[model samples]
Target: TNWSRRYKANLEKLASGDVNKVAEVVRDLWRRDQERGLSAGEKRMLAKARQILVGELALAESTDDAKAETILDEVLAAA
Candidate 1:
C-alpha cells in the first residue's frame, strides 16, 4: 500500500502546522497523478488528501470547505 503510506506521510506534513508545506505536497501529488495514472486506492487517497487539505485551508482562511474544494478543483481542471 505505497499510496496509503504516502498518504500518511502527507498527513504528517499537514499536521506539522505548515500550510505551505501541506499545499506544496498536495500540488506535487496532483502533478504526479496527472503525469501518470492513479489506481482506485490511490485515487481514494488523493480524495482524502483533498479533503484534509481543503478543510485546513478553509479553516485558516475563515471560509467554507466547499469553497476551498472548488478552488482546488479549478486548479486541477483540464487545461
Candidate 2:
C-alpha cells in the first residue's frame, strides 16, 4: 500500500532528532488507525514506532534528547 510506504517518512521524522517528530508520527498513525484500521504492516509499524519512540524518549529523559535521536536512527536501521 502506498500509505504503508509512508512508513519510511515516519521513520525519517523520528530520526530528525526532535522529540516532537516522534510523537507526531505516533499520533498520526494512531489517528489513522482509529479512523479506519491499519493493515498488518501498518499495525506492526505502529507497534514498533510506539515502542522505539517512547523507549527512546524515556532514554532521552534519563540522559539527553540528542542521544535519544541517535538511538532512534540506529534502532530503526536495524528494524
Candidate 3:
C-alpha cells in the first residue's frame, strides 16, 4: 500500500482505539518525510503535532480515555 493510505489508516486506527500500531506507522512516516527533505519549519511543525499526538496516545494507552480525547480535541482545535 501507498504511504498516504498507510498514513490515513494510522490515524483512523488511533481514533478507533487501536493505538498500538500508531507509533510504528508514525515512525515510518517520519523517516520517509526526513528522507524527502522537509523544510526546517515544516519539520518543526510536524514534530510539534506528533508530540501532541504521542502524548494523547500515551494518555489513552494508560487508561485516561477522557483526558486523551479532550487533549486531542483541544490540540486539533488550536491555531
Candidate 4:
C-alpha cells in the first residue's frame, strides 16, 4: 500500500462511506506505523481517521490496530 502525498485524499475515502477504502487505509497506515514507521503527517491522519471510525458507533473506542480492525470489520459487516 503506497502512502499518498496528499493525506487528505486518503482521508476523503473515509468520508465516502467506503469500508474498503477506510479499511485499506487503516490497515496500511496502522501496519506501517506498527512495523516500520509512519510520517508525522500520516500519523496525524491516522489518528484523525481513527477518531472518526471509532466514533461511528458507541460499542468501542480504538487505540490500536487490533481494535481499529475489529471495529472496522463490524462496520463492514453492518453495512
Runs in model 2 deviating more than 4 A are 1-5, 64-79
**Shift in Å, residue 38, candidate 1:** 1.1
Model 2 Cα lDDT, one tens digit per residue, 2-25: 764687788788678576787788
Local accuracy of candidate 4 as per-residue lDDT tens digits, 27-51:
7789889899998888887886776
Model 3, residue 26: distance off in Å is: 2.1
lDDT of 1 by residue, 1-79 (tens): 9867877787687677676776766686788789997768666656766777788777868766678898989989954
Index of the highest-lDDT prediction: 2
Ranking, lDDT, top scorer first: 2, 1, 4, 3
Instruction: Estimate, for each residue in 1-79, the C-alpha lDDT of model 3 and write its tens digit.
Output: 6755755665665455444454554565587677886556445645654775678767767787777888999999994
lDDT of each: 0.74, 0.81, 0.63, 0.73
Q: Weakest 10 consecutive residues, lDDT, candidate 2?
A: 14-23
Residue 28 lDDT (model 3): 55
| Clashes by residue pair, model 3 | none
In model 3, where do residues sit more than 4 Å from their true spots? 1-3, 38-53, 56-79
Comparing candidate 2 with candidate 3, which one achieves the higher TM-score?
2
lDDT of 3 at 52: 57
Selected candidate, larger lDDT, 1 vs 4 = 1
